[PDB]
Design a protein around this ligand. Structure first.
Ligand code: 68L
Length: 377
């Protein structure tokens, strides 16, 4: 799959996009890769933030579904008009599919001023598609209309970011060691179950339901490791204790202010590793993924008012459950094995580390009562 390696680009804090084409003749657009939503939605009007936008009037293969879609979400909103057209991924498999496209005609806080993407590719399942599950997501259309296998994998490498989206397979040069798989609990978001959490090997010793209240998902469209409120408190308390050779203000831990060091002398050593144990493939079997401060202390570049190496604490509290965003995914090669309802993790060959510690995927471990860790209404 050499042709798909390095097909992702981006900038820090702005996410990862892939090149796509829509319509006939093909119109090229950069599209954010989002495993936490399920609509293919593209800018279709000249918003001033946009480098370009889908011009349906130029496409002979465009078909109008004569239907609108209104999509508020937690941090913004978009609105648009539904249709279908021919879509392809130049640095992806050599195919063209007829897919649903929402032509975005109005938005708020959706497009980012200064970003180089003009649309969003929701890779999750029909259950959370807008307006309803009858609007078949792109990846479903792709697999149904071609012989592309029903899986994809993401290597997100974290000021220009890069990575690979391998569509229909796995590229073994992108990771080291073995893949370890966790079941997709339910096909809506990429929902998984965290069974145990450690800070520097020290169990938080919470009831594991707390870790998945009310869900845990893998999400390339979020920067942070987001944790349920009670788990975040406990995590921060333990992280504070482990790093207490230096002290930092209460605002920092809340992501309300940054912290700065002299260039090339950030004290990585004083920050602990974070380990999430995930439900394994076998009864009573788990594995663990481990990230470094290099993943959860994220450098902020655009601080015009400062001169030093500044960082944001990128673990935060949530009311929507655990979100394994970029802070997790940048540690690993992640295989969204839809065909087998599972997600594979392996150590990423591009993850940022130091000479003393590296991100890790280890198993098998013996963990009982893993089914009780799931939340049910
Ligand atoms: N996963 C996720 N997708 C977001 C929110 O979180 C969404 C995320 C982003 N993400 C980023 O800009 C971004 C920034 C940095 C990094 Cl590392 C990743 N992504 C942008 C627009 C956007 O716009 C969205 C629009 N709609 C949704 C919906 C989710 C559930 C069903 O209804 C729509 C989600 C989203």
């Amino acid at each position: 799959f050499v042709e798909m390696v390095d097909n992702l680009r981006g900038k820090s804090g702005q996410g990862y996009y892939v090149e796509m084409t829509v319509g006939s003749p093909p119109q090229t657009l950069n599209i954010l890769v989002d495993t936490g939503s399920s609509n293919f939605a593209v800018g279709a009007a000249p918003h001033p933030f946009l480098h370009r936008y889908y011009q349906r009037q130029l496409s002979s293969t465009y078909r109008d579904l004569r239907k609108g879609v209104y999509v508020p979400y937690t941090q913004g909103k978009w609105e648009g008009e539904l249709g279908t057209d021919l879509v392809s991924i130049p640095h992806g498999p050599n195919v063209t599919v007829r897919a649903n496209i929402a032509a975005i005609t109005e938005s708020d806080k959706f497009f980012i001023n200064g970003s180089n993407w003009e649309g969003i590719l929701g890779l999750a399942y029909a259950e959370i598609a807008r307006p309803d599950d009858s609007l078949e997501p792109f990846f479903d259309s792709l697999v149904k209309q071609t012989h592309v296998p029903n899986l994809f994998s993401l290597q997100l490498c974290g000021a220009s970011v890069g990575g690979s989206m391998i569509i229909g397979g796995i590229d073994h040069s992108l990771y080291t060691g073995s893949l370890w798989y966790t079941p997709i609990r339910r096909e809506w978001y990429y929902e998984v179950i965290i069974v145990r959490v450690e800070i520097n090997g020290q169990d938080l010793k919470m009831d594991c339901k707390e870790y998945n209240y009310d869900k845990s998902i893998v999400d390339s469209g979020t920067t942070n490791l987001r944790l349920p409120k009670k788990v975040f408190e406990a995590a921060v308390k333990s992280i504070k204790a482990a790093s207490s050779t230096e002290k930092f203000p209460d605002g920092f831990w809340l992501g309300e202010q940054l912290v700065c060091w002299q260039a090339g002398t950030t004290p990585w050593n004083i920050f602990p590793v974070i380990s999430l144990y995930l439900m394994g493939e076998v009864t009573n079997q788990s594995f663990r993924i481990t990230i470094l401060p290099q993943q959860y202390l994220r450098p902020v570049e655009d601080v015009a008012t400062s001169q030093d190496d500044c960082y944001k604490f990128a673990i935060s509290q949530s009311s929507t459950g655990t979100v394994m965003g970029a802070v997790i995914m940048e540690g690993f090669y992640v295989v969204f094995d839809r065909a087998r309802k599972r997600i594979g993790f392996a150590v990423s060959a591009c993850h940022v580390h130091d000479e003393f510690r590296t991100a890790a995927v280890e198993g098998p471990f013996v963990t009982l009562d893993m089914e009780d860790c799931g939340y049910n209404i």
